[PDB]
Design an enzyme around this catalytic site. Structure first.
Site, PDB file in Angstrom:
ATOM      1  N   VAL A  56       4.936  20.237   6.043  1.00 60.76           N
ATOM      2  CA  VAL A  56       5.459  19.924   7.370  1.00 60.76           C
ATOM      3  C   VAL A  56       4.940  20.981   8.331  1.00 60.76           C
ATOM      4  O   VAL A  56       5.263  22.164   8.193  1.00 60.76           O
ATOM      5  CB  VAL A  56       6.996  19.874   7.388  1.00 60.76           C
ATOM      6  CG1 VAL A  56       7.503  19.584   8.790  1.00 60.76           C
ATOM      7  CG2 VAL A  56       7.525  18.834   6.404  1.00 60.76           C
ATOM      8  N   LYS A  63       7.807  15.403  15.669  1.00 57.49           N
ATOM      9  CA  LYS A  63       8.223  14.027  15.427  1.00 57.49           C
ATOM     10  C   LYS A  63       9.628  13.980  14.853  1.00 57.49           C
ATOM     11  O   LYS A  63      10.406  13.079  15.185  1.00 57.49           O
ATOM     12  CB  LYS A  63       7.222  13.321  14.513  1.00 57.49           C
ATOM     13  CG  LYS A  63       5.918  12.975  15.227  1.00 57.49           C
ATOM     14  CD  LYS A  63       4.820  12.598  14.242  1.00 57.49           C
ATOM     15  CE  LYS A  63       3.660  11.869  14.899  1.00 57.49           C
ATOM     16  NZ  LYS A  63       2.873  12.730  15.835  1.00 57.49           N
ATOM     17  N   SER A 171       6.867   4.803 -13.699  1.00 58.10           N
ATOM     18  CA  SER A 171       8.246   5.093 -13.309  1.00 58.10           C
ATOM     19  C   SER A 171       9.239   4.737 -14.411  1.00 58.10           C
ATOM     20  O   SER A 171      10.308   5.351 -14.484  1.00 58.10           O
ATOM     21  CB  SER A 171       8.606   4.355 -12.017  1.00 58.10           C
ATOM     22  OG  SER A 171       8.571   2.943 -12.206  1.00 58.10           O
ATOM     23  N   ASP A 181       6.093  -2.096 -11.368  1.00 57.93           N
ATOM     24  CA  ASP A 181       5.227  -2.767 -12.328  1.00 57.93           C
ATOM     25  C   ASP A 181       5.505  -2.186 -13.723  1.00 57.93           C
ATOM     26  O   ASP A 181       6.352  -1.300 -13.897  1.00 57.93           O
ATOM     27  CB  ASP A 181       3.758  -2.630 -11.904  1.00 57.93           C
ATOM     28  CG  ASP A 181       3.205  -1.211 -12.083  1.00 57.93           C
ATOM     29  OD1 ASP A 181       3.943  -0.289 -12.503  1.00 57.93           O
ATOM     30  OD2 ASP A 181       2.007  -1.020 -11.787  1.00 57.93           O
ATOM     31  N   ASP A 183       3.427  -0.215 -16.720  1.00 59.19           N
ATOM     32  CA  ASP A 183       2.225   0.527 -17.084  1.00 59.19           C
ATOM     33  C   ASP A 183       2.260   0.860 -18.572  1.00 59.19           C
ATOM     34  O   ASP A 183       3.252   1.400 -19.077  1.00 59.19           O
ATOM     35  CB  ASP A 183       2.089   1.803 -16.241  1.00 59.19           C
ATOM     36  CG  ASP A 183       2.136   1.506 -14.731  1.00 59.19           C
ATOM     37  OD1 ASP A 183       1.285   0.734 -14.254  1.00 59.19           O
ATOM     38  OD2 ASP A 183       3.044   1.993 -14.019  1.00 59.19           O
TER      39      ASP A 183
HETATM   40  N1  LIG Z   1      -2.927   7.327  -6.700  1.00 60.84           N
HETATM   41  C1  LIG Z   1      -2.418   7.306  -7.934  1.00 60.84           C
HETATM   42  C2  LIG Z   1      -1.648   6.188  -8.379  1.00 60.84           C
HETATM   43  C3  LIG Z   1      -1.168   6.227  -9.636  1.00 60.84           C
HETATM   44  N2  LIG Z   1      -1.435   7.288 -10.469  1.00 60.84           N
HETATM   45  C4  LIG Z   1      -0.854   7.395 -11.821  1.00 60.84           C
HETATM   46  C5  LIG Z   1       0.549   7.998 -11.794  1.00 60.84           C
HETATM   47  C6  LIG Z   1       1.435   6.761 -11.797  1.00 60.84           C
HETATM   48  O1  LIG Z   1       2.772   7.020 -12.245  1.00 60.84           O
HETATM   49  C7  LIG Z   1       0.649   5.847 -12.732  1.00 60.84           C
HETATM   50  C8  LIG Z   1       0.956   4.383 -12.572  1.00 60.84           C
HETATM   51  O2  LIG Z   1       0.787   4.088 -11.169  1.00 60.84           O
HETATM   52  P1  LIG Z   1       1.680   3.009 -10.443  1.00 60.84           P
HETATM   53  O3  LIG Z   1       0.978   2.532  -9.229  1.00 60.84           O
HETATM   54  O4  LIG Z   1       2.036   1.965 -11.475  1.00 60.84           O
HETATM   55  O5  LIG Z   1       3.082   3.835  -9.997  1.00 60.84           O
HETATM   56  P2  LIG Z   1       4.455   4.273 -10.675  1.00 60.84           P
HETATM   57  O6  LIG Z   1       4.515   3.603 -12.046  1.00 60.84           O
HETATM   58  O7  LIG Z   1       4.669   5.742 -10.695  1.00 60.84           O
HETATM   59  O8  LIG Z   1       5.481   3.518  -9.834  1.00 60.84           O
HETATM   60  P3  LIG Z   1       5.937   2.006  -9.605  1.00 60.84           P
HETATM   61  O9  LIG Z   1       7.388   1.966 -10.036  1.00 60.84           O
HETATM   62  O10 LIG Z   1       5.811   1.794  -8.126  1.00 60.84           O
HETATM   63  O11 LIG Z   1       5.019   1.149 -10.428  1.00 60.84           O
HETATM   64  O12 LIG Z   1      -0.731   6.092 -12.379  1.00 60.84           O
HETATM   65  C9  LIG Z   1      -2.165   8.387  -9.999  1.00 60.84           C
HETATM   66  O13 LIG Z   1      -2.347   9.345 -10.751  1.00 60.84           O
HETATM   67  N3  LIG Z   1      -2.651   8.358  -8.729  1.00 60.84           N
HETATM   68 MG   LIG Z   2       3.910   1.601 -12.167  1.00 65.24          MG
HETATM   69 MG   LIG Z   3       0.686   0.318 -12.366  1.00 66.25          MG
END
Ligand SMILES: Nc1ccn([C@H]2C[C@H](O)[C@@H](COP(=O)(O)OP(=O)(O)OP(=O)(O)O)O2)c(=O)n1
Ligand SMILES: [Mg+2]
Ligand SMILES: [Mg+2]
Ligand code: NA
EC number: 2.7.7.7
Length: 326
Positions: A56, A63, A171, A181, A183
């Site tokens: 920040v 903002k 996640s 999603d 993974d």
């Molecule tokens: N720019 C990014 C996007 C993703 N990832 C890695 C970390 C994420 O946890 C993993 C899977 O990406 P997802 O887009 O599936 O995101 P998340 O699983 O963390 O969250 P969601 O609940 O939105 O699927 O890939 C990364 O290193 N850099």
């Molecule tokens: Mg994911």
């Molecule tokens: Mg994914």
DNA sequence: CCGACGCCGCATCAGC
DNA sequence: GCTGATGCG
DNA sequence: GTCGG
């Protein structure tokens, strides 16, 4: 949710810079500030209080003061009023349409969902599937459904070959109550950094999950990464479950721990961790952590036998998956 | 100031 | 066909 | 947009 109004504002600003301005570093700047504020454990009362956090600076502080005084941000209210920006922001919500394609469609007068349905002939394969399931891909996945999906994928993978190991990451692995999603990290002993002793290792899995009608569509597919669509089976007379995005990544077995660290995320956590590795003189990707030489060239892979081993190299105390949701 | 900002797989295209 | 750049995730 | 040197 202490500062949800502030972090929402910053997220909308980040999406603006990515989708409209095509300014990826501004997008990452806003995303880092929103992340540091989201985990700040007090209700922020001023822009100067926020400026004390890393990421920040002066502009965002100003903002935050405007937002706390008025509940609004003029910059965003104008952006919300601009049709071109609004239309570009909307089109990028379709999987496979990025800011470049979104600006090109808008240049050609394709600016609405009806416009995209009408012009399917102008979409590549991925964009076509992203449009097909636009509504569904907007929905979150409750953890209870992720649990049933997990059970299908692990059991179907065992049936192909008992030596595969499938690990749900993202996640889900961080303990989230809902996910965007599924993974899936995949390993098999025939595929290491040294040798690929069987061909078609990911294909076989994909084919089997298609055969039992779990996987319904393919966005992209290579030897080590599948991106596609899947659906839970429903019961007699019950409404169908939404279609869901599924990502599968086959990693060399001897590189499991780097791969599971990467695929557990979050994306901002990975970004912060990899940047800190650089400051510490290492580079981390999903396969290895390597040292940087005096010339800045990555050296050879350091030995890794746990997730914590990686944290140890860069002198970070270990953080459980659930504490990595930045 | 101002350079650096994490890292990479797959799809597509230009140029040969 | 291959290589390298680019878009997208 | 931010920040370290
Ligand atoms: N720019 C990014 C996007 C993703 N990832 C890695 C970390 C994420 O946890 C993993 C899977 O990406 P997802 O887009 O599936 O995101 P998340 O699983 O963390 O969250 P969601 O609940 O939105 O699927 O890939 C990364 O290193 N850099
Ligand atoms: Mg994911
Ligand atoms: Mg994914
Ligand atoms: Na998109």
């Amino acid at each position: 949710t202490l500062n949800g109004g502030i972090t929402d504002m910053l997220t909308e600003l980040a999406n603006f810079e990515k989708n409209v301005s095509q300014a990826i570093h501004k997008y990452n700047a806003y995303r880092k500030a929103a992340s540091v504020i989201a985990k700040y454990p007090h209700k922020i009362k001023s822009g100067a209080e926020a400026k004390k956090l890393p990421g920040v600076g002066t502009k965002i502080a100003e903002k935050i003061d405007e937002f706390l005084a008025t509940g609004k941000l003029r910059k965003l209210e104008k952006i919300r009023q601009d049709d071109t920006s609004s239309s570009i922001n909307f089109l990028t919500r379709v999987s496979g349409i990025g800011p470049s394609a979104a600006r090109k469609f808008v240049d050609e007068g394709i600016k609405t969902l009806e416009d995209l349905r009408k012009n399917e002939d102008k979409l590549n394969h991925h964009q076509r599937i992203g449009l097909k399931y636009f509504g569904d891909f907007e929905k979150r996945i409750p953890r209870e459904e992720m649990l049933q999906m997990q059970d299908i994928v692990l059991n179907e993978v065992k049936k192909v070959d008992s030596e595969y190991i499938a690990t749900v990451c993202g996640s889900f692995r961080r303990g989230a109550e809902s996910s965007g999603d599924m993974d899936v990290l995949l390993t098999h002993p025939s595929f290491t950094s040294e040798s690929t002793k069987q061909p078609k290792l990911l294909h076989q899995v994909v084919e089997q999950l298609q055969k039992v009608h779990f996987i319904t569509d393919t966005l992209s597919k290579g030897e080590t990464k599948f991106m596609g669509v899947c659906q839970l089976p429903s019961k007699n007379d019950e409404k169908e479950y939404p279609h869901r995005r599924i990502d599968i990544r086959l990693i060399p077995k001897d590189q499991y721990y780097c791969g599971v660290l990467y695929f557990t995320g979050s994306d901002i956590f990975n970004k912060n961790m990899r940047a800190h590795a650089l400051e510490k003189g290492f580079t981390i990707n999903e396969y290895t952590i390597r040292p940087l030489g005096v010339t800045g060239v990555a050296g050879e892979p350091l030995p890794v036998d746990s997730e914590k081993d990686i944290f140890d190299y860069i002198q970070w105390k270990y953080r459980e998956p659930k504490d990595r949701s930045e």
